[PDB]
Amino acid sequence: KTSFGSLKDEDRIFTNLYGRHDWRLKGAQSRGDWYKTKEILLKGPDWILGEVKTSGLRGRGGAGFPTGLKWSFMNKPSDGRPKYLVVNADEGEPGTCKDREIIRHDPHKLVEGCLVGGRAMGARAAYIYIRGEFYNEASNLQVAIREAYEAGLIGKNACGSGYDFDVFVVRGAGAYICGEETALIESIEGKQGKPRLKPPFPADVGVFGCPTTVANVETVAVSPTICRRGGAWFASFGRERNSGTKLFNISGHVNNPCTVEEEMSVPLKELIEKHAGGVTGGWDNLLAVIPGGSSTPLIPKSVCETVLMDFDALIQAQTGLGTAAVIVMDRSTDIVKAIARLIEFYKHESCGQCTPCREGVDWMNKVMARFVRGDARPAEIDSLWEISKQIEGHTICALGDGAAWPVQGLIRHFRPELEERMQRFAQQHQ
């Protein structure tokens, strides 16, 4: 297969994504979930890890790390300390509104994902670190977890297997940095959400000092569907090492913004012009696309012609995918004001722990606040580039990287627009 996209409805993992079906447990067994779970639990952790490693599932939270090798770090015997599968549900990524759909509309799929993933590595309990702003989704998920306990599916003797397993929900309090896995671990412990330093990885020392895997809602909720439908079925889609399906979040200057599931290697032009009803003004009106949420460098209209919306083709497009959030920016958009507002986001959402992020993101926002008005000289462009090259790779987590990357993409693809901005500043203010 070389032609990708146009995914059928019978291969969609996410049935009832839109909210048109009953999300509760008697409606969840009508859609295939919580079915043949005991025969999953009684094949050991190693068969589950083999069906994840065979499936080619990669990280859906912004990292792109492979899921099976990640969970195989936790396949070690205990030494008096328990283990925890914590599901990252923070979803502070601008553009990305997909895990909100998974929690709000398929909560029992998430709970079954928690149970199967905790079986996969021998975890004792589960924490769903939902966002504090998603309070309706939190109560929705808690009603579903109550319906999970009141059937015998989780808790004491989960699904009739002799495997005890809790599921908790911890709410955030409005911090984007709690989306990162080590700061999420620090946020469960009741402290400031400031990220840990690796090593020690969470697979050795995670939450409370216990071995812990923090995994996204999307990469957790699809894994019982992987184990039921088949690992070769799930690896049969997408290109090589880019398998699976993906919940794309098309927002911005489109006619119909949408959260929609599509095969992994879909062309971006095909995705926008099919599932969103086209860019406002048409494809000729397209200026740029922020491809995968705020932490990815934007791609202009010449790159949006042929590129495939998986990890490796966007690496060849010298950008990233991450959470696959297509923020569409037409020709009527002031691109510099949009990127400056996004850097304002990154300075109002940054925990302030270590020096390069804490100083460089505020300093880049001051430089971008001068670039919008044009209040500079063009020799400060590449200097700002060096500022990004003094942030990228010298921080603790990838929020410094995720704040350096949009400025790098903006400069590298729209340098002469900045130069004409500053020369028209120079002519009309002096």
Partner 1 sequence: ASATRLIQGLRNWASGRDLQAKLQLRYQEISKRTQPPPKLPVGPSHRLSNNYYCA
The answer to the question of residue 79 lying near partner 1 (CB under 8 A) is no
Hey, which residues between 376 and 415 contact ligand FMN (CB under 6 A)?
A: 397-399, 402
Among ligand FMN, partner 1, ligand SF4, none, residue 216 binds (CB under 5-8 Å by kind): ligand FMN
Verify binding: residue 383, partner 1, rule CB under 8 A: yes
Which conformational region is residue 52 in: left (phi greater than 0), alpha (psi within -120 to 50 degrees), or beta? Answer: alpha
DSSP 196: P
How do beta strands 238-239 and 242-243 pair? antiparallel
Tell me the residue number closest to ligand FMN, measured at CB: 179
> Stretches 33-41, 214-222, 297-305, 384-392: which one binds ligand FMN (CB under 6 A)?
214-222
Q: Are 325 and 284 in contact (CB under 8 A)?
A: no
Distance of alpha carbon 67 from alpha carbon 49, whole angstroms: 9
Residue 66 touches which of partner 1, ligand FMN, ligand SF4, none (Cβ within 5-8 Å per kind): none
Closest CA to 370 of 384, 360, 359, 357: 384
Q: How far is the CB of 344 from partner 1 (least distance, A)?
A: 23
Among residues 10, 79, 284, 386, which is the contact residue for partner 1, using CB under 8 A?
A: 386
Considering only residues 133, 147, 380, 417, which one is a binding residue for partner 1 as defined by CB under 8 A?
380
**Which of 223, 353 has the CB closer to ligand SF4?**
353
Question: Nearest-CA neighbor of 137 among 173, 100, 111, 171?
Answer: 100
178, exposed or middle or buried, with CB in 10 Å at 0-12, 13-18, 19+? buried
Each residue 353-392 as x (binds ligand SF4 by CB under 6 A) or -, in order, gives xx--xx----------------------------------
Q: Is 88 in the site for ligand FMN (CB under 6 A)?
A: yes
Indicate which of ligand SF4, ligand FMN, partner 1, none lies near residue 386 (CB less than 5 to 8 Å, by partner kind).
partner 1
Contacts of residue 198, defined as CB under 8 A and 6 or more positions apart, other chains included, come to 182
Cβ closest to partner 1, residue 121 vs residue 384: 384
Question: Which of the ranges 53-61, 76-84, 301-309, 377-385 carries the binding residues for ligand FMN, by CB under 6 A?
Answer: 53-61
Binding at 117: pick from ligand SF4, ligand FMN, partner 1, none (beta carbon under 5-8 Å per type): none
Least Å distance, CB 424 to ligand FMN, is 35
Separation CA 34–CA 107 (nearest Å): 11
Within residues 217-246, the interface with ligand FMN by CB under 6 A covers 219
Cα distance between residue 333 and residue 329, in whole Å = 6
Site for ligand FMN in 160-179 (CB under 6 A): 179
Q: State the nearest-atom distance from the C-beta of 387 to partner 1, in Å.
A: 10
* Residue 274 touching ligand SF4 (CB under 6 A): no
State both tokens at 367.
């430089």
3-state secondary structure (DSSP) of residue 377: coil
Cα separation values, 422 from 201, 257, 418, Å: 46, 34, 6
What are φ and ψ of residue 294, in 5° steps?
-65, -30
Contact status, residue 259 vs residue 5, Cβ threshold 8 Å: no
User: Minimal distance in Å, beta carbon 389 to partner 1?
Assistant: 10
Which among ligand SF4, partner 1, ligand FMN, none contacts residue 195 (Cβ within 5 to 8 A by kind)? Answer: ligand SF4
Over the range 412-427, which residues count as b (16 or more CB within 10 Å of their CB) and which as e? Answer: ebbeeebeebbeebee
Question: What is d(CA 193, CA 9) in angstroms, rounded to the nearest whole number?
Answer: 40
Phi-psi region of 220 (alpha: psi -120 to 50; beta: other; left: phi over 0): alpha
Q: Determine which residue in the list 379, 416, 428, 429 makes contact with partner 1, applying CB under 8 A.
A: 379
Structure tokens at 71: 């969970």
Token output for 177: 């940095």
Q: For residue 208, which amino acid is it? A: F
Minimal distance in Å, beta carbon 407 to partner 1?
15
CB of residue 390 vs ligand SF4: minimum separation in angstroms? 12
Question: E strand or H helix at 148, and its extent?
Answer: helix 135-149
The smaller minimum CB distance to ligand SF4, of residues 27 and 174, is found at: 174
**Residue from 177, 220, 338, 384 that binds ligand SF4 (CB under 6 A)?**
177
List of residues contacting ligand FMN (CB under 6 A): 59-63, 65, 70, 88, 90-93, 179-181, 214-216, 219, 397-399, 402
List of residues contacting ligand SF4 (CB under 6 A): 177, 195, 350-354, 357-358, 395-397, 399-400
List of residues contacting partner 1 (CB under 8 A): 379-380, 382-383, 385-386
